[PDB]
Write a protein that holds these residues in place. Structure first.
Motif, mmCIF file in Angstrom:
data_model
loop_
_atom_site.group_PDB
_atom_site.id
_atom_site.type_symbol
_atom_site.label_atom_id
_atom_site.label_comp_id
_atom_site.label_asym_id
_atom_site.label_seq_id
_atom_site.Cartn_x
_atom_site.Cartn_y
_atom_site.Cartn_z
ATOM 1 N N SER A 188 0.703 -1.056 0.251
ATOM 2 C CA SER A 188 0.127 -0.116 -0.184
ATOM 3 C C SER A 188 0.609 1.357 -0.029
ATOM 4 N N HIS A 189 0.168 2.675 -0.769
ATOM 5 C CA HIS A 189 0.928 3.589 -0.640
ATOM 6 C C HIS A 189 0.613 4.580 -0.107
ATOM 7 N N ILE A 190 -0.462 3.889 1.155
ATOM 8 C CA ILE A 190 -1.426 5.193 1.232
ATOM 9 C C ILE A 190 -0.664 4.918 2.749
ATOM 10 N N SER A 191 0.357 6.165 3.398
ATOM 11 C CA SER A 191 0.920 6.924 4.412
ATOM 12 C C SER A 191 -0.070 6.341 5.756
ATOM 13 N N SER A 192 -1.524 5.906 5.639
ATOM 14 C CA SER A 192 -1.377 5.791 7.666
ATOM 15 C C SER A 192 -0.851 4.026 7.322
ATOM 16 N N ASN A 193 -0.989 3.514 6.567
ATOM 17 C CA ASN A 193 -0.999 1.943 5.834
ATOM 18 C C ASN A 193 1.094 1.837 6.698
ATOM 19 N N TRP A 194 1.553 3.044 6.843
ATOM 20 C CA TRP A 194 2.983 2.264 7.197
ATOM 21 C C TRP A 194 3.420 1.596 8.451
ATOM 22 N N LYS A 195 2.658 1.331 10.059
ATOM 23 C CA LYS A 195 2.365 0.507 10.596
ATOM 24 C C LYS A 195 2.574 -1.248 9.559
ATOM 25 N N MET A 198 5.204 -2.151 7.190
ATOM 26 C CA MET A 198 6.909 -1.932 7.980
ATOM 27 C C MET A 198 6.257 -3.847 8.533
ATOM 28 N N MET A 199 5.627 -4.547 9.146
ATOM 29 C CA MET A 199 4.779 -5.812 9.605
ATOM 30 C C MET A 199 5.449 -6.756 8.442
ATOM 31 N N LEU A 200 4.458 -6.320 7.505
ATOM 32 C CA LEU A 200 5.319 -7.394 6.040
ATOM 33 C C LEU A 200 6.539 -7.278 6.023
ATOM 34 N N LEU A 201 7.032 -6.498 5.660
ATOM 35 C CA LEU A 201 8.745 -6.720 5.555
ATOM 36 C C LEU A 201 9.328 -7.682 6.623
ATOM 37 N N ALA A 202 8.973 -6.672 8.101
ATOM 38 C CA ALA A 202 9.387 -8.082 8.675
ATOM 39 C C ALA A 202 8.707 -9.326 9.061
ATOM 40 N N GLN A 203 7.793 -9.787 8.389
ATOM 41 C CA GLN A 203 7.278 -10.772 8.668
ATOM 42 C C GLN A 203 8.122 -12.212 7.719
ATOM 43 N N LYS A 237 10.419 -9.173 16.187
ATOM 44 C CA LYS A 237 10.710 -8.063 17.143
ATOM 45 C C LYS A 237 11.405 -7.099 17.046
ATOM 46 N N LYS A 238 12.275 -7.076 16.200
ATOM 47 C CA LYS A 238 12.550 -5.500 15.441
ATOM 48 C C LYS A 238 11.507 -4.063 15.038
ATOM 49 N N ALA A 239 10.382 -4.732 14.273
ATOM 50 C CA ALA A 239 9.631 -4.482 13.706
ATOM 51 C C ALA A 239 8.622 -3.629 14.737
ATOM 52 N N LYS A 240 8.292 -4.725 15.728
ATOM 53 C CA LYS A 240 7.900 -3.813 16.885
ATOM 54 C C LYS A 240 8.199 -2.995 17.549
ATOM 55 N N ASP A 265 8.225 2.061 20.076
ATOM 56 C CA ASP A 265 9.241 3.825 20.118
ATOM 57 C C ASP A 265 8.941 5.060 19.485
ATOM 58 N N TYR A 266 8.112 4.443 18.105
ATOM 59 C CA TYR A 266 7.650 6.489 17.416
ATOM 60 C C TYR A 266 6.753 5.930 17.978
ATOM 61 N N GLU A 267 5.457 5.553 18.042
ATOM 62 C CA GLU A 267 5.052 6.101 19.520
ATOM 63 C C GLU A 267 4.873 6.773 20.486
ATOM 64 N N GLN A 268 6.039 6.474 21.073
ATOM 65 C CA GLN A 268 6.205 6.806 22.723
ATOM 66 C C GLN A 268 6.859 7.776 22.509
ATOM 67 N N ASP A 269 7.935 8.002 21.663
ATOM 68 C CA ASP A 269 8.607 9.071 21.541
ATOM 69 C C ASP A 269 8.175 10.288 20.651
#
Length: 277
Positions: free
Chosen positions: A105-112, A115-120, A126-129, A134-138
Motif C-alpha cells: 500500500s502506498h497510503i501513508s496511514s498503512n505505514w505500520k 513495516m510489519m509485512l516486510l518484518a514477517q 521483534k525488531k519491527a515491533k 518507540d515511535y509512538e512513545q517518542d
C-alpha cells in the motif's frame, strides 16, 4: 507460511531474503530501517541512490519506480515480489507470473502494516515491533513537551523540484507526521491540495508560516541548482516571518526521503523535535 496483509492472505517461503522490490519505494525505506538486503530493488535513473546503497549491496535492478522490468524479475526467481498499489491490475497480473506478488500500500496511514509485512517476510517481527513502539512513545513524549506556542503555530513543508516550489495534501509526504501525528493545524492551501501542488513565493508570503521545512535535492534540480539560493536572496523571502525568526529548516531529513514511511516518519519526528522544542 500464511501472511495476512491488508485483509488478504498470501502464502510465502519465510523467512526469506529472495525479495524483489519493484515500484514500492515504501518497502525500500522499510528495508533501510529493518536492515533488510533484498535480491531485487528499484533503480532510480538507471542506478541506486547513495541513500539506498546501504540496502542494495546484494541487489539487482528490478526496473524504474513505475516501470517494473518483468524479464529481470523473472530471472531472479524470487520467493516474493513486493509490488505497489500504484500499479494497475494488469501490470500486477503480469508481475504475478514471476512469483508470489504482494501490492504494498502506498497510503501513508498503512505505514505500520507495510513495516510489519516486510518484518514477517524476513523474520524480524521483534525488531519491527520495537521500532513502532518507540515511535509512538517518542511521539507522545515530544507532544507533551511542545509548548502551545509551537502547537498552535503555522508550520509548512515545501519541496523544491525542477526549480519549482511544491506543497502536498494533509495526509501526504511529511504532512502526515507534522499535522496528523504532531497535531499542528494544516494551512488551508494544504487542506485543499489533492496532490503535489505548485505554489510560490507569493503564496508562501500569503500564508507567512511560522515554521517552514524546505526539502531540496540536487538530483531533482539538475537544470536549476541555483533555485533555492535565488529564492533565499529574494527580498520577499527575507521578509517572511519564518525567515526573520530563523525558523526555516532546509533538508532536516535526507532530501530524497519519501515522507510517509516508518523511516521518513522516524527521521522527521526527530527533526521536528529538534526544531519545535
Amino acid at each position: 507460511k500464511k501472511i495476512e496483509y491488508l485483509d488478504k492472505t498470501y502464502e510465502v517461503t519465510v523467512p526469506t531474503d529472495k525479495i524483489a522490490i519493484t515500484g514500492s519505494v515504501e518497502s525500500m525505506e522499510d528495508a533501510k530501517l529493518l536492515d533488510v538486503h533484498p535480491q531485487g530493488a528499484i533503480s532510480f535513473s538507471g542506478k541506486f541512490p547513495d541513500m539506498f546503497k546501504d540496502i542494495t549491496d546484494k541487489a539487482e535492478p528490478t526496473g524504474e519506480k513505475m516501470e517494473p522490468n518483468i524479464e529481470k524479475i523473472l530471472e531472479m526467481k524470487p520467493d516474493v515480489i513486493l509490488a505497489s498499489t500504484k500499479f494497475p491490475e494488469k501490470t500486477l497480473q503480469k508481475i504475478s507470473t514471476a512469483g508470489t506478488t504482494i501490492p504494498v500500500s502506498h497510503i501513508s496511514s498503512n505505514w505500520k502494516e507495510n513495516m510489519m509485512l516486510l518484518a514477517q517476510l524476513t523474520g524480524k517481527e521483534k525488531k519491527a515491533k520495537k521500532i513502532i513502539a518507540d515511535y509512538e512513545q517518542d511521539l507522545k513524549e515530544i507532544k507533551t513537551k511542545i509548548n502551545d506556542k509551537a502547537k498552535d503555530s503555522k508550520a509548512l513543508v515545501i519541496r523544491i523540484r525542477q526549480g519549482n516550489i511544491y506543497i502536498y495534501p494533509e495526509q501526504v509526504y511529511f504532512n502526515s507526521t507534522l499535522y496528523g501525528d504532531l497535531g499542528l493545524k494544516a494551512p488551508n492551501e494544504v487542506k485543499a491540495a489533492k496532490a503535489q501542488e505548485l505554489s510560490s513565493l507569493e503564496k508562501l508570503s500569503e500564508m507567512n508560516p511560522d515554521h517552514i521545512f524546505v526539502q531540496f535535492s540536487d538530483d531533482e534540480n539538475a537544470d536549476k541548482p541555483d533555485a533555492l539560493k535565488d529564492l533565499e536572496k529574494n527580498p520577499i523571502w527575507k521578509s517572511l516571518k519564518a525567515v526573520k525568526e530563523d525558523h526555516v529548516y532546509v533538508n532536516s531529513v535526507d532530501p530524497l526521503a519519501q515522507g510517509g514511511t516508518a523511516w521518513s516518519k522516524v527521521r522527521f519526528l526527530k527533526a521536528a523535535a529538534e526544531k519545535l522544542t
